[PDB]
Symmetry: D3
Subunit: 156 residues, 6 copies
């Protein structure tokens, strides 16, 4: 069978975007992931109007309200909460989605790029996570048998 | 009546710590806050040990587990979720705590330093918050009649 | 001790409003109720504007969003969920609030006008309720020792 | 893939029943709906004994208890909460199921018959809903990619 | 301030009842506990009838339903979940109440008889608990500052 | 379609183990159960190190923490909470998992061996359960259409 995921990932820094690209590739090769019916924030911004390209909407309460809800809905309707984590550039946005994921009883999986694996991550991120793998493990990670496991890196 | 809070505020930078101190002072003055029974993270780390003071605990799974568990317990057993926020120094740990407090039916209140007030904040942070105020309002905020409200500034 | 409530009661009809007033009076007399800190919907509409008084807000998504959010916040931050009920004038808005209060671990208490007491109520309303009482008991109900009980009347 | 649904719909008024019939038809033609393994209240009344045809059970606490629980179970085990909504004849029953649906992290979809689309609906119904479509949109609505969207009608 | 509890403690054996009595006495002495408003199961059975005193209620679905509902209500409307625990006489009913109290954001506190303290307890019980103490500490435990902690003994 | 399950069952007593064996057999013959992708505690003990065969880990906080979380994760990621219940030898462990199952919105199914069916079970177990069948009914129980039903035995 196949499980769907919420692609929790930033797009602010270059490193964030580098991971984003590797993450999608890995997920495409994964046989237990139904990527088409999954939810990816970028591909689901309120009626195509994402602020960073046409910024009048940064102050638009309606746009913000819709985008926020669309995201929360994208987490609760999908099976796995996937968070592309970068130790040196942690995102408050992703953090909130992790805690929300917890409340929705979802398997919270964190993926750290191989180069950063080991670097101290925030304590709360360490505690909420159900497992923390290396980016290279992603493509073969079996989402049909999700299991608990401690991040073998450090906290701060 | 008086409300107890969970003091969510990072202590990882000079600005954060400045805000941390300021907020602590405002609360001691707030007639509607029982600070003596509130939960303050840095005063509840497992074994009373801070990892910055004792790096030998950086990979101690037991320390991480207890400290994490103690914190979730602080959020769930207290009335209000307080989040000292720095727009350009956003804490992923605080983000998670916002989502969890949300899951526990708590009133989420962000406090932004006066100087920083107005700066754009992460979309998800703007979403979970029930209200957001300046540091200089924290001293009088009536916690017995917590109401909802939008942030004046923008989101990114 | 004293308990705060979320005053769930429709104001869309003559009978509803009559019940609304009656209940408000009973609560002011109840020694176990802190009405001064309770949440009453009509006193917390966004911007202080009622849509019946200002129809220009009928399609205002921001007004709807804030008012809705303020209400959910009233339910979650208060002790008891009070529902003024009219068997043959059942409010769908109140129904939703019953399910949400249920989700928030709140004690759900329905108050039916003496005259209407005994009339059949919707199955789902009879289910979520923790107890249901006549309007004339509301004045003395001990909110400090909230117990469960079946409605004497029937369901439809 | 296919998602299952809880068919939340009344059967009290003629209009309610008219929508009920159109709703089922639409769902039969929908390729993303597994209608057979879904839950529909009528087809699941406690051991065939629905009150309106053999009414001694209106006062039977056991019958009411079983029917209520069977419904709540029908919502939590299925994927989508479908509510056939009629603006002029809103149902408190359906409302409670909507709020409960929320607590269970379910996608709440509302379907209003094309003739009524636009008519003001209760505020709480507007806020709980994840999306509100026209009856004619049902048959082609893709339940594999549920998304957020505001009801373009009015509130009250 | 003072905290109310839900008195979870089995009364099905000589030892259990001995612990039951002991704990009741410690609480009457505890300055931080409002026992007068706490919920004690045996004092809230439906109709005031114990099934051991009236076996004709052994298969009464209504009695079971009300009593069960009253208990869940006691857990959700009170502050602390207290669990009087006997390592070699573990109550499945108490186990369930631990998971539910956990679901309601309550502080779970196990009290083990001094003599029994140190004996291994079930893994799941050791997990949900926020803290576990000897019977002789219950008299002074500060319920206003509930903290997390591991059990000294083992698990099985 | 097929649903997955959390195999909640003890292995302490001979009778517990007798039921365990019959339970697995029944589940193998069941066409609506995807047994391979399900979760069974024994087959998932923290890195093969189960205490009862190499007991130094009874006092290992890390082992206990991991095993506990792995179990909770096994319940929330799977569809049905299956509890192999033995009236004469109830398990506190299983009870906690039942209440947790409730919080996760899972269908809670109890299976009592035919010889014991009818024997009084704990009240809390009776109330949390969504249905209670005889062991012989298991293999043909359709998990695609889970329904509510009262245990026809007694309580205590």
């Amino acid at each position: 069978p196949k499980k769907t995921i919420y692609f929790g990932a930033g797009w602010f820094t270059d490193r964030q975007n580098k991971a984003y690209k590797e993450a999608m590739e890995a997920l495409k090769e994964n046989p237990t992931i139904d990527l088409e019916n999954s939810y990816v924030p970028l591909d689901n911004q309120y009626k195509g109007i994402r602020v960073d390209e046409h910024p009048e909407y940064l102050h638009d309460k309606v746009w913000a309200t819709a985008t926020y809800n669309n995201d929360l809905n994208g987490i609760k309707t999908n099976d796995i909460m996937l968070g592309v984590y970068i130790p040196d550039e942690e995102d408050v946005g992703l953090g909130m989605e992790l805690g929300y994921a917890l409340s929705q009883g979802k398997y919270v999986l964190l993926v750290i790029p191989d180069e950063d694996y080991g670097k101290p991550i925030n304590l709360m991120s360490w505690g909420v996570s159900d497992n923390v793998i290396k980016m290279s493990q992603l493509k073969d990670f079996n989402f049909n048998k999700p299991r608990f496991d401690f991040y073998e890196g450090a906290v701060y």
